[PDB]
Structure formats: C-alpha cells, structure tokens
Design an enzyme around this catalytic site. Structure first.
Site, short mmCIF file in Angstrom:
data_model
loop_
_atom_site.label_atom_id
_atom_site.label_comp_id
_atom_site.label_asym_id
_atom_site.label_seq_id
_atom_site.Cartn_x
_atom_site.Cartn_y
_atom_site.Cartn_z
N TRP A 23 0.85 -1.19 0.00
CA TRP A 23 0.00 0.00 0.00
C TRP A 23 0.89 1.25 0.00
O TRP A 23 1.66 1.45 0.94
CB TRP A 23 -0.89 0.02 1.26
CG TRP A 23 -1.92 -1.09 1.31
CD1 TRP A 23 -3.16 -1.08 0.73
CD2 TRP A 23 -1.77 -2.37 1.93
NE1 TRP A 23 -3.79 -2.29 0.95
CE2 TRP A 23 -2.96 -3.10 1.68
CE3 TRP A 23 -0.75 -2.98 2.67
CZ2 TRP A 23 -3.16 -4.40 2.14
CZ3 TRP A 23 -0.94 -4.28 3.13
CH2 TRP A 23 -2.14 -4.98 2.86
N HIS A 49 -7.18 1.58 2.01
CA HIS A 49 -8.20 0.59 1.75
C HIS A 49 -9.32 0.82 2.75
O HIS A 49 -9.19 1.66 3.63
CB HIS A 49 -7.66 -0.86 1.83
CG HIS A 49 -6.88 -1.18 3.06
ND1 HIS A 49 -6.30 -2.42 3.27
CD2 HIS A 49 -6.56 -0.43 4.15
CE1 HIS A 49 -5.65 -2.41 4.42
NE2 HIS A 49 -5.80 -1.22 4.98
N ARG A 76 -4.09 5.99 -2.65
CA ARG A 76 -2.76 5.37 -2.73
C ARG A 76 -1.86 6.22 -3.62
O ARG A 76 -2.28 6.68 -4.68
CB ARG A 76 -2.83 3.94 -3.28
CG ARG A 76 -3.57 2.99 -2.36
CD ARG A 76 -3.40 1.56 -2.78
NE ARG A 76 -4.46 0.75 -2.20
CZ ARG A 76 -4.62 -0.55 -2.42
NH1 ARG A 76 -3.78 -1.21 -3.21
NH2 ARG A 76 -5.65 -1.19 -1.86
N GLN A 117 -13.39 1.06 -3.10
CA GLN A 117 -13.40 -0.35 -2.74
C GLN A 117 -14.69 -0.65 -2.01
O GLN A 117 -15.41 0.25 -1.58
CB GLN A 117 -12.25 -0.70 -1.81
CG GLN A 117 -10.91 -0.74 -2.46
CD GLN A 117 -9.85 -1.25 -1.53
OE1 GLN A 117 -8.77 -1.65 -1.97
NE2 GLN A 117 -10.13 -1.24 -0.23
N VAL A 120 -5.73 -11.76 7.09
CA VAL A 120 -6.49 -13.00 6.89
C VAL A 120 -5.59 -14.22 6.83
O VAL A 120 -4.41 -14.11 6.54
CB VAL A 120 -7.39 -12.99 5.62
CG1 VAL A 120 -8.51 -11.97 5.79
CG2 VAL A 120 -6.56 -12.71 4.39
N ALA A 159 -13.59 -12.04 5.38
CA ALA A 159 -13.60 -10.67 4.91
C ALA A 159 -13.17 -10.69 3.45
O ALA A 159 -12.46 -11.61 3.01
CB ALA A 159 -12.62 -9.80 5.72
N1 LIG Z 1 -7.76 -4.45 1.75
C1 LIG Z 1 -7.29 -5.40 0.68
C2 LIG Z 1 -8.47 -6.23 0.13
C3 LIG Z 1 -8.93 -7.29 1.08
C4 LIG Z 1 -9.94 -7.03 2.00
C5 LIG Z 1 -10.30 -7.98 2.95
C6 LIG Z 1 -9.65 -9.22 2.97
C7 LIG Z 1 -8.64 -9.49 2.04
C8 LIG Z 1 -8.29 -8.53 1.10
C9 LIG Z 1 -6.60 -4.70 -0.48
O1 LIG Z 1 -6.42 -3.45 -0.42
O2 LIG Z 1 -6.24 -5.42 -1.44
#
Ligand SMILES: N[C@@H](Cc1ccccc1)C(=O)O
Ligand SMILES: N[C@@H](Cc1ccccc1)C(=O)O
Lengths: 266, 266
Positions: A65, A94, A120, A134, A177, A230
C-alpha cells in the site's frame, strides 16, 4: 396551429455518477444476502489502517500500500465510540480499517459491507488511479467458515454475470487474513477470467487487537469464540468492465459529456 | 437590494403515496432476508384464486372471502407461462393465487414476497375497505420448516418495531396451509398486541395442484420432495399504525392535503 411536437420547457434532468451506480448495485446484491452498509472516515490513523490489521511498520508487507501521510494540528479524529484518537494521520489505503472500527463498536454475529473512497500514492494512467473505490465485506460469528466466503463470492458472481458465471479462488497473502485468497470471476460475454478482489478468514490477531482496544475502552471482549471472513473488491475495475469504460481517469474527470451517459442506468 | 429570502421559482415537488412507502419498507425488510418481489394480475380465474389453493366451491371456507365476480368476453387472461387460461373471472380476494402462478413457472428452492392490490365485497368504513393491499410471502425448499416461518416473522417484527419487539403465533385455519397460524406483533410504543396476518406450511394439496398443472403443461414435477411456508399480511392496517392514520378510506380518497403529508417519508 398548436405544434405539439415542439420542444417544451427546458427543465433540468439529473443523473448519478457511474461509481454511485456500480456501488449501489454491489450494495443491493449484498443486502439481499443479509449485509448492511456502513461507511468509515477517509482520514484514518496508522492504528486502524495498519497496526490493528496486523500490518506493522518497516514491514515488507506494508509496501503493498503506497500511503499518503498527513500533517497539521487542530484536526480531531474520532474513534468507533466518538472518543478522540491519536496516531500518525493518513488517507486510508483501503476500507479494511472499518472492519476494526465496526467490530469494537458492535457485537457478533453480523454481516457488513463497507464501500468508500480510498487513496494510494500512484501514477494515474489508463487503468490506475491514486483515488479509487473499494467495497469491503465482513461476516463474523460462531462456526463461520471459508465455505461461506466461497458461497458469498459465488452469489456475487451469479448476480453480476448470470448463471453461466463462475468463481475461482487461489491462495494469496494478506496480513489480516489466514487462510488468504484472491478470487476471480468468469465473465461469459468477455470469455475472460476477471480478478475482482482478495479475501480470507479474519486473522487471529485482528480479533485480539479488537478486543484489546475494547477493554482499553471499558467494553467486554466479544471476539474470542468466533471466526469470520472478509473480502475487498475494487469498484472502478468492475464499473469499467460493466459499463464498457476505457479510461479510469474519467470517473474523476468531470466531463458532463461523460457523466451524462449514465442518466439511463439512472 | 437583492432580497435573498424571497420565494424562488415555484418548481413542483413530488411525493410517494403512503401505501407505496409502507410496501417499500416491507419489501426492503424481506429483501434483506433473501426474498424477491414479483407481482401478479388483479383479474384472476377461480382456479388460481380458489381451486388451486384448496378452496373448493360451495365450501363454507370460501365464505372467508367476499368475492367480486366479473363478466365480459374479449378479455384474454394469461397463465404463468403466457398461455391463455379459462374459468370464471374475478378480482383476486388476496395475493395468494400468485403463490401458484410462481411455483408452476419456477423451481425450488426460492423466496418470494408478492405485494399487490386486492378486492373484497365489503362496506367501506373507518377500518374496512373493499380495495386494499396485501403482501404475500412464500419460501419453498427441502427441509423448510415452521421454525423458519417463526424466524421470518420474528425478523419482520424486529425490523419493524425495534428490539423490544416480539411476535406471537396461534393456531388458525387456512385451506392452503397446515399447520395453520395467525401471528401478532408486540408494538412497544402502543403497548398493544397487533394482529398482522396469517401463515403456515404450504398445504400438501397446493403442491399437488401445482405439479398437476405443470404436467398438464408439459413441465416436469418440481414439488414432490419439498416443503415450505407462506404468510400474508395487510398493508393498510400496518401503514395506519405506523404513520398514525385514523381513517383507512383516505388512501384511496385522493386528498392532496393528505398525500402531501408523506413527502417527508419520501
Ligand atoms: N484491503 C485489501 C483487500 C482485502 C480485504 C479484505 C480481505 C482481504 C483482502 C486490499 O487493499 O487489497
Ligand atoms: N391469503 C390469506 C393470508 C395468508 C396468506 C398465506 C398463508 C396464510 C394466510 C388471507 O387473505 O387472510
């Protein structure tokens, strides 16, 4: 003669921006599955954007990021319970930090979907933007398994591309995750595999951060005996493939000749 | 001086009828639970309105609905698959006939909710109408039980009246369900038990009528190994208690001074 085929009073006709349309359809799809939409703040603290999501500093994983850091006093950022919070300010990279804000302010089980503008530091071209959108997904509760995450995405695909649609899941890495995964959908018309987003089972450390912040705030723990999944998917990429838009820069461009083209899709 | 607090161009401001509002909220509530809304025709045949729903003629049970019979040739009523159908025409006395139309045109499992205008020969007073609205509910599929019907109504109550809300079920009779039941909800503010509608597990004869009509039409049977629940609730009664309306006759009255009062609730 009273010409009836003559132009009438020029009353204005409005319209909704293509991202609003795409976001709406996405929210409708998940509402039908039991998800409720809540939003978060665009200016976040490093704690919610990174630390609470198992993304420590000087972490080779924090490079996934490109962050916009902020400066300036007088600004009062409130936490999940209105309480003022501290930490280096930034533009969320995000929507994920909302997963944390929500969990400390509510109790399982639940289903949320959080849309929102994210930022970003990147070079804006034909298929890249520094400012995009998103849509997060978060479902937590006893016995919640990955079979449910796959089920969710499967319904997303069906609703989005028809019965000849299908989804594929492949392992991928995310600090928040585990198991981790990227998912792609089969778009019949284009006959191509579209990569939509990432997902996984909420990471054990996320729940801990949540309950730790809770106790530090007086609330009782609420996430020790639950699991959850998620997901997060990019809005523009999808809006583009769906409305046949070639350049992602138009969204923020402002050309009426462009926006006006979606008065039809409402 | 350029008086800025002066009335501007009198552009018209619209609004939605209170029943449309109530129906919408009801549809939103059930959409979140997985239900999809489909409508049926107001002019039905005795077959769909009665016979297919286990309500035979000269049946003491057929008296629970005061029917408006119709006359006139030239009118072509189409069935579930567009096919022209025959039988004594009438104004549907409830939305229930749509349960049958849908089931012959689709396959389980599914969740539908069918709103719609209904008619009954009655004297129109303060809390009675010959023309009102109902909202049907139909969920069919393997292992579908009454525990699910109770769960559905429970969610309906919560969404409608808050967490201090509760529902009660009591046995009652309907030719198209068995077990049969009437359900009431606890409205905290009014501190009263409101009777909302009736429901039950789809009657064995309904499924048979459905599959019989199917074969007679070339389709294969689709309801021999499934069960389901159905419910129907009055819209006006609910709209009244919710918008604090004293007289049910206003809905069709037409008084702008009345309708205009709901521009707020959209
Ligand atoms: N926040 C992640 C996306 C994501 C959300 C939740 C679980 C896994 C992945 C991204 O910017 O790519
Ligand atoms: N059609 C019924 C309501 C109902 C619908 C479905 C099941 C049971 C009852 C009525 O007019 O009262």
């Amino acid at each position: 003669r009273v010409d009836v085929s003559l132009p009438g009073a020029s009353l204005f006709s409005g319209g909704l921006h293509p991202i609003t349309l795409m976001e709406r359809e996405l929210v409708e799809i998940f509402r039908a599955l039991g998800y409720q939409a809540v939003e978060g703040p665009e200016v976040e603290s490093e704690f919610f954007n990174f630390d609470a999501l198992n993304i420590p500093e000087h972490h080779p994983a924090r490079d996934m990021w490109d962050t916009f850091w902020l400066t300036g006093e007088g600004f009062r950022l409130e936490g999940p319970l209105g309480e003022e919070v501290e930490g280096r300010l930034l533009l969320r990279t995000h929507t994920s930090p909302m997963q944390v804000r929500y969990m400390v302010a509510h109790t399982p089980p639940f289903r949320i979907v959080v849309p929102g503008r994210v930022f970003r530091f990147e070079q804006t071209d034909a298929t890249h933007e520094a400012v995009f959108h998103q849509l997060e997904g978060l479902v937590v509760g006893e016995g919640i398994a990955m079979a449910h995450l796959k089920g969710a995405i499967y319904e997303l695909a069906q609703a989005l591309f028809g019965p000849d649609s299908k989804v594929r899941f492949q392992p991928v890495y995310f600090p928040f995750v585990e198991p981790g995964a990227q998912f792609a959908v089969w778009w019949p018309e284009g006959g191509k595999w579209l990569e939509l987003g990432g997902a996984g089972m909420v990471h054990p450390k996320v729940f801990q951060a949540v309950d730790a912040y809770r106790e530090r705030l007086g609330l009782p723990p609420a996430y020790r005996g639950v699991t959850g999944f998620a997901f997060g998917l990019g809005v523009e990429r999808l809006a583009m493939l769906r409305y046949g838009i070639p350049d992602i820069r138009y969204f923020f461009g402002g050309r009426l000749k462009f926006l006006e083209q979606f008065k039809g899709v409402l």
